[PDB]
Write an enzyme that holds these catalytic residues in place. Structure first.
Site, PDB file in Angstrom:
ATOM      1  N   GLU A   1       0.423  -2.638  -0.742  1.00 41.66           N
ATOM      2  CA  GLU A   1       0.633  -3.672  -1.892  1.00 41.66           C
ATOM      3  C   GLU A   1      -0.357  -4.722  -1.499  1.00 41.66           C
ATOM      4  O   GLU A   1       0.181  -5.431  -0.845  1.00 41.66           O
ATOM      5  CB  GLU A   1       2.232  -4.051  -2.413  1.00 41.66           C
ATOM      6  CG  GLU A   1       2.974  -3.006  -3.142  1.00 41.66           C
ATOM      7  CD  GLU A   1       2.564  -2.506  -4.585  1.00 41.66           C
ATOM      8  OE1 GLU A   1       1.452  -2.937  -5.042  1.00 41.66           O
ATOM      9  OE2 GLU A   1       3.263  -1.667  -5.104  1.00 41.66           O
TER      10      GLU A   1
ATOM     11  N   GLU B   1      -4.742  -1.336 -11.253  1.00 36.96           N
ATOM     12  CA  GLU B   1      -4.891  -1.883  -9.932  1.00 36.96           C
ATOM     13  C   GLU B   1      -6.225  -1.974  -9.346  1.00 36.96           C
ATOM     14  O   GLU B   1      -6.474  -1.418  -8.131  1.00 36.96           O
ATOM     15  CB  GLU B   1      -3.651  -1.179  -8.816  1.00 36.96           C
ATOM     16  CG  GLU B   1      -2.228  -1.680  -9.250  1.00 36.96           C
ATOM     17  CD  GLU B   1      -1.331  -0.708  -8.997  1.00 36.96           C
ATOM     18  OE1 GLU B   1      -1.288  -0.140  -7.933  1.00 36.96           O
ATOM     19  OE2 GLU B   1      -0.215  -0.606  -9.698  1.00 36.96           O
TER      20      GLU B   1
ATOM     21  N   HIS C   1      -1.756   0.054  -2.965  1.00 44.72           N
ATOM     22  CA  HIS C   1      -1.228  -0.376  -4.598  1.00 44.72           C
ATOM     23  C   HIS C   1      -1.676  -1.825  -4.351  1.00 44.72           C
ATOM     24  O   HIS C   1      -2.069  -2.445  -3.496  1.00 44.72           O
ATOM     25  CB  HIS C   1      -0.071  -0.045  -4.775  1.00 44.72           C
ATOM     26  CG  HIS C   1       0.357   1.425  -4.928  1.00 44.72           C
ATOM     27  ND1 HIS C   1       0.739   2.012  -6.194  1.00 44.72           N
ATOM     28  CD2 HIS C   1       0.525   2.418  -3.994  1.00 44.72           C
ATOM     29  CE1 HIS C   1       1.193   3.162  -5.945  1.00 44.72           C
ATOM     30  NE2 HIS C   1       0.899   3.340  -4.927  1.00 44.72           N
ATOM     31  N   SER C   2      -1.235  -2.437  -5.591  1.00 44.23           N
ATOM     32  CA  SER C   2      -1.402  -3.742  -5.754  1.00 44.23           C
ATOM     33  C   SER C   2      -0.474  -4.169  -7.171  1.00 44.23           C
ATOM     34  O   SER C   2      -0.129  -3.159  -7.641  1.00 44.23           O
ATOM     35  CB  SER C   2      -2.794  -4.445  -6.005  1.00 44.23           C
ATOM     36  OG  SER C   2      -3.296  -4.252  -7.559  1.00 44.23           O
TER      37      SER C   2
ATOM     38  N   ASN D   1       3.101   7.992  -9.786  1.00 44.58           N
ATOM     39  CA  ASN D   1       3.774   7.661  -8.478  1.00 44.58           C
ATOM     40  C   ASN D   1       5.320   7.603  -8.307  1.00 44.58           C
ATOM     41  O   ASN D   1       6.161   7.114  -7.671  1.00 44.58           O
ATOM     42  CB  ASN D   1       3.424   6.243  -7.794  1.00 44.58           C
ATOM     43  CG  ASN D   1       3.808   6.086  -6.498  1.00 44.58           C
ATOM     44  OD1 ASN D   1       3.772   7.077  -5.545  1.00 44.58           O
ATOM     45  ND2 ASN D   1       4.478   4.779  -5.950  1.00 44.58           N
TER      46      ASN D   1
ATOM     47  N   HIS E   1      -2.457   4.179  -9.621  1.00 41.46           N
ATOM     48  CA  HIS E   1      -1.976   3.208 -10.870  1.00 41.46           C
ATOM     49  C   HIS E   1      -3.387   2.670 -11.116  1.00 41.46           C
ATOM     50  O   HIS E   1      -3.849   1.520 -10.432  1.00 41.46           O
ATOM     51  CB  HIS E   1      -0.876   2.126 -10.410  1.00 41.46           C
ATOM     52  CG  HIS E   1       0.271   2.846 -10.596  1.00 41.46           C
ATOM     53  ND1 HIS E   1       1.360   2.361  -9.357  1.00 41.46           N
ATOM     54  CD2 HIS E   1       0.886   3.972 -11.024  1.00 41.46           C
ATOM     55  CE1 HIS E   1       2.452   3.028  -9.691  1.00 41.46           C
ATOM     56  NE2 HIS E   1       2.291   4.004 -10.583  1.00 41.46           N
TER      57      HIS E   1
END
Length: 305
Positions: A270, A72, A196-197, A144, A69
């Site tokens: 995350e 991020e 991810h974040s 994702n 993504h």
């Protein structure tokens, strides 16, 4: 810049700078790192993976991807730090050294190149790929949610304009298929981590189904241990559990796919923070974020070896 020792790890970089960094790292550690191209993005950009290995033939491997993504940014920045860290700790850190002496690590720093370039050029918060379809004026797919794991099920949108659009069919996005093809051909991955974040969470399968994985006890304890290790540096608190029970149902996820391929140690991180800055995490938090996350990733790797 001219050396990975002069490269500024405490600031965000463009795609070109990160691609240059890769070549610098390989030139500096030819006996440990190699750069592989596993495909090309929708807009023709090369998709690179860094392979860390001390030798052997098809040794058990660990997969780590970041930036699926694009907005991020803390992930791609952490990926660059990880790459450098691997080269500095081999031969210095007893535990990491043992891991590399027996296993290979494949690191994909920029999983979604087109979206990354777009976040620098036009929209800082863009997250999807940049593929187009005649059926709509909207662009991109949520990479994702494009994997063959409960594809199309609840927890994804069938609208091309949605931020969580899953795509026309499983693996329709070349950025995803490139990884699928590589991992299947390799056939010897033991761990699969996707970074991810944000939210500060450590998750394991599944996201598309309420069914509990048969390895829940083990993965749950591994997660508990990794979270404890990560918290030891700055006190950053993470929560952990299955995707569906911790967040919500989400289909077509990467670790759900990997786990169904027989890759037991499949986890999703995350990173920071919990909302204060969200996707726009301050550059001053890059290094401490990478440092603590490393402790968590290493813990999982130790359990894998």
């Amino acid at each position: 810049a001219r050396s990975t020792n002069t490269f500024n790890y405490a600031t965000y970089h463009t795609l070109d700078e990160i691609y240059d960094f890769m070549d610098l790292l390989v030139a500096e550690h030819p006996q440990l790192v190699s750069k592989l191209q596993i495909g090309r993005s929708y807009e023709g950009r090369p998709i690179y993976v860094l392979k860390f290995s001390t030798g052997g033939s098809n040794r058990p491997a660990i997969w780590i991807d970041l930036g699926i993504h694009s907005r991020e940014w803390i992930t791609q920045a952490t990926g660059v730090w990880f790459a450098k860290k691997f080269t500095e700790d081999y031969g210095q850190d007893p535990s990491f050294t043992a891991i590399l002496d027996s296993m290979d690590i494949f690191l994909e720093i920029v999983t979604n190149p087109d979206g990354f370039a777009f976040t620098h050029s036009q929209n800082r918060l863009w997250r999807k790929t940049r593929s187009v379809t005649s059926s709509s004026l909207c662009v991109g797919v949520d990479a994702n949610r494009n994997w063959d794991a409960g594809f199309g099920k609840a927890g994804a949108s069938s609208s091309p304009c949605s931020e969580t659009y899953h795509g026309k069919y499983a693996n329709s996005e070349v950025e995803v298929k490139s990884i699928v093809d590589f991992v299947k051909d390799h056939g010897n991955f033991k761990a699969f981590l996707s970074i991810h974040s944000y939210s500060q969470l450590l998750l394991y399968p599944y996201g598309y189904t309420t069914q509990s994985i048969p390895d829940k006890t083990e993965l749950n304890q591994v997660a508990k241990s990794a979270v404890a290790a990560l918290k030891s540096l700055y006190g950053t608190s993470y929560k952990y559990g299955s995707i569906i029970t911790t967040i919500y149902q989400a289909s077509g996820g990467s670790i759900d796919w990997s786990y169904n391929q027989g890759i037991k140690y499949s986890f999703t991180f995350e990173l920071r923070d919990t909302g204060r800055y969200g996707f726009l995490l301050p550059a001053s938090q890059i290094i401490p974020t990478a440092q603590e996350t490393w402790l968590g990733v290493l813990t999982i790797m130790e359990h894998t070896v």
